[PDB]
């Protein structure tokens, strides 16, 4: 599979990518000089955990096009933007390794965390590798990196051998954490890359990400091996943690630069933990917002408390019966039809096991709103806008511009299944609907 | 005349209604198994007293549609809501009889007393007819009502005969308080209803209105006959009065269930009295609203106390001299010109005996400010809107859409050309004028 | 509710009708001189039995328009055709009483049993009431009926009294099977009719239905009371049974002409029996047809037998689990995807309790058919035709004109819920799909 | 340029107006019998001082329509209201001369000081010119003004000669403070007016503005010449000052009525001083808005404090070196390139002495917007909209509709000098750019 990110002369620039599994999108950005297939140990684990795994090969690496231009992090991040937009990924998590951390930092800084839910940095370059006067926390001076470029240009194939020796810490890990054959494959992948890209890549390593770091607002994870030879822990992760103290910090003892394979077990554990925790963290903050908004329209009393209880139960994951819940709603004495309708919409939306209940009439009759053609006109116009929308805060603001009558019908469109919007947006709509009703 | 309240299959559900007279809207909700025409003795009296009488037939009764669904008080109240909103009634009084009492309680509870000014309950079902463990004040157990439904299903036509026998207490009242022909008509009206509705109605009688009662905030009247066979006074009105002690309680001695006809004179007397009382009650709440709004613009001090006292005196009926008041106003310090104008407007409006005093110059100069308001078009367009208006709340909301400058000029037009708007509307304007000034 | 069936001068001709309940449509055609409300005892029972009850008032009767034209069975049947077509009734059962049997016979003869599933004749006029030379089985000669017309014209109101005496056999049944009040109501309904229609109707009674009878192909029921005074059993039902020996014959002993009320219990039992039996009779013949067609594409073996067994189980009503059935289908070794797809469509369509299974991908991927735009073009064109169609034989023929590839996609449209067709038509499609595949 | 203020018969009533310069709006209302061009000496000074000068001709005067109706200050003020609302001026300063002072007083009184920031009265009519019993401080009685009207009607052209003799105090000022040619032009302007307006205007002079005066809440300036023959100082300004003691009072010694030209230097000085207090007040509120918006994108730390200080310094007028600031900006390690670009744009825009500093490379590369042709296209579309815009709030709103990428490139267009927008608009863009960045 390929995604076109540019054009070089008579040829086009396409990136090889892979899209597997169903769930929240997790983008895995490989490091030098490998490819997307490097994540296979992580990829295997993430697929088991019910995630949607997306991997791609950087330009001039793996199966991607090998142009002789655009080897800078502004172009690398631009490519990632194209990738995310082409696939239309929403609420996705970016995971970068080695060079890949640079792409994450730069994209977030330059394009914003709109589509991004969280970020993870494994074996990061950040904040600045170059050792200069203003940056004494650099790993090595300019002259050093110039040596690497010249080394690759001398003989890239022979370079790869020496490269992977410190990439995996073979003197320690060979025959224990990484096999001879596994290394052999990595070398093949390296050779498969572009000759130009090979020597062009090291110049990108001393990129100054210090300006990109503050723009990271989504939950972050910083992971790094102490036995990292290529990128020394202290010149990278340790100072990176000072720049981003909010980030979850993980130090894997004795892990080499290539810990994705060698210490895969420690990596998976740490990553899957961070992902599951950050997911439930944003689920709770979303559901508590929905609760307060829905309860805002319900009049204070013993009924309000009962509703609050059943809402908490389904939000907590306590598999309640839906036929019973709906029969309970239908039979309520002081609740207004619209209130019952909104509640009916919210319960079907949040309940995982629909159990087999056909779209109830009492909910449908509540949301239609007299079946005014004036109301259904604004409802489709709003529906068009919500299809493009993804953020909850984004979906709520644009919906607020519409009247309470138009909003109710819009909810009815979705309920009847004449509409296909994401849950975050659907919650945006219902919260906006509740807000208008509360002010009436 | 019909109002669509729903839809059943290929057909729509419309309720037959009647709208007569001009004045404050009085909605009369009939009981089982009759129709809106039952109120004819009350309607005749209410029309004489200059009220606007609105009657409608419950679904499956009289000239209304006869569906086989929606025979519950939640649906009954929804229908009433549609009726009130379709006609856009404001500050109206709901009067219920037998079953009609259930609709009043439920609507007030579920939809709020926004459009409602006061409520009346004649021969009420409230609070709970069903005799259970938690409710020993019930009239009869579940098994009893199951007999009635089965009795109606057996032969509804033959049932009506036995029903009206106790409905009017015929052994006593026939040939005395109700004629053979009058009952004959009642029987016809009963038969004219829906066959399904006939047997569906008794199940609604044991509805638990105990939760609906506390939500009654508007002035209430509870009337009931002591000789009521259908709904025994002690299991209904007496316990209802304990639940709603604020309500005006009337016990008609020896009156049967269908006292609307038999003891019509006693009923009319009591009802017109309560209505007249609720008018003065809402008149007071109107003047207290005007006081607070007028007082909102006057700066705290000894003058504010003097004005508030002088306002209370004229509101109480303590007939003050107007030439003196106006001379008193004219000579007040610290008073903004607009403030003196508003007060001058209020005083001429509230003082009964204007004595024959020519339109004061200082008020004209205080509000209008030497500029002729008639020339200003915005003042006239609002004046045009206020001529159509009747309610205080209706006049105040539409006036708020205009700027403070336009409102002052509008007040000037009324004062100058000896305005021809109702006092209730006139107060809406001044309160709206005060509200704009209070903010900026 | 009204349905316009014509126009008389400046006015239009509308028929009052009622549409209640959900299920198979049962049309109840009243007799002289009553209205649709006459069925109330039958109507009450039919609604309990989960039927859709449709009643209407004949022109010049009950709440219908009262024109001075069109009082002949060709017009009466034309009105019924309009009624059936306006409501778009499908697979409906016609039930006629007294005059109403004439409408059933004439409509079936003149318009065909396309929309009709079965017919019932209670207190029939058929085959010919007029006593002439060619028809000695007539009840009375021309001169007699001329007397009735003249009797109605003399005084219709006084006529009604004498009419209902023999209509109900009051000397026997009054105070036992029919109350004084019940009769009173019937008289009111009679008087409510048109003066012209009253005297015009008897001329319709001696209509020759002998030519209409052979055209009755749907299952029929003939019910009649032996104590029938208005229409003597021997001059009507007994000779009618000789003309239609296929019909289910029921003789209610001692029942009068008005047995709908008096002997309602015997009537309901007999009618509900005939309806339930005729329904299951057409359900079995439909399902056995579907079975043979579906099995035609499955290759002979142990798998074919297993499929046949699970098909019989769901058709018999044995509530099988659907998640299990679908998992069983998905996991089959030699079954082709299209075969699995067709089977997936058939099981969801026939299983009453969907249990809560989201539209399975394996079925969707089977029916899409490579997602050829050429196939989806013919599929919508066919879908348009099937929306108009209702008969299984009718739906199958028009579908056969389309290619196997186009048919599979059409099934996919319905499965995805982008289409709304009746079950009989849906079965027509699947059988046509199976037929094309079998010949490939 | 024209603004329609009414309609007279087949024709419409339009007022000629002029809108020049950028900044806070200053409305100049001319006197009798001239036009807006009379302010030319003031306009020249006000344009130099960076104001937005708006002048218009009164109905029947200058280039405005010459109707035969609406010659009263209620109509004059209505016209002014239309002008202010059509142009949607906000926080504007009204400056009136002779008759023009009447419009200011009346509009402020009748329409409120919503859009007005301050008011100025030069050679005022206020409070009341008519000499009566209740007003002994009047200049002349009714009979006198009737003489002027009759004088104009006799021969307006010959009247103009004698009028300007006392308007400018020609015996004193001719050949000294006003030239023969200047007067000649004034005469032409007078003759150019309407014949009807000419004789209708004097009747408006004895208008009672005494009630309008208290309604003036914005800061006021009262200027008047002692040598005023037309409107005697003691009967006008002196008594006006007693009515409005809060007002800034300026008496120009020996100045005639038409002091706008003769004593232009004294007038301008006094006026610009009074205006400068209100202008500097609104400049700061604009710069504080820009500051908060610019600081919004800078990440918290010691650097944020440093920037805010340097921003306050340049806004205060502290001539900071720009070459130093830009080098300081260029060398910051944690500032994002876009951030450096925006700040660079702001500094070049706010720093007066640009000192001939060439367009910095680092700013250009930040604003280029990744040289996306799609981003560059949207920027031009926005630039077209910004070319039409004039207000800061207006420029900010329309810019917010564009993406952050499109906004940055648009700033690049202006910075590179491929675009020409006003400073207020330019700030709108930069603030809109910051707002998008803050939201990510």
From Swiss-Prot, chains A, B, C, D:
InterPro entries linked to this entry: AB_hydrolase, AB_hydrolase_1, AB_hydrolase_fold, Epox_hydrolase-like
Concerning Pfam families, the annotation shows: Abhydrolase_1 (PF00561)
GO annotation (BP), single: antibiotic biosynthetic process
Q: Which UniProt keywords apply?
A: Antibiotic biosynthesis, Oxidoreductase, Peroxidase, Plasmid
What GO annotations for molecular function exist for this entry?
A: peroxidase activity
Q: Write the Enzyme Commission number(s) for this entry.
A: 1.11.1.-
The active site annotation covers 98, 228, 257
Location of the AB hydrolase-1 domain: 25-263
Q: Which PANTHER family does the entry link to?
A: HYDROLASE, ALPHA/BETA FOLD FAMILY PROTEIN (PTHR43433), NON-HEME CHLOROPEROXIDASE-RELATED (PTHR43433:SF4)
Recorded family membership: Belongs to the AB hydrolase superfamily. Bacterial non-heme haloperoxidase / perhydrolase family.
Subunit architecture: Homotrimer.
State what this protein does: May be a chlorinating enzyme involved in 7-chlorotetracycline biosynthesis.
Per its record, how is this protein called by name? Non-haem bromoperoxidase BPO-A2
- Per the record, the gene is bpoA2
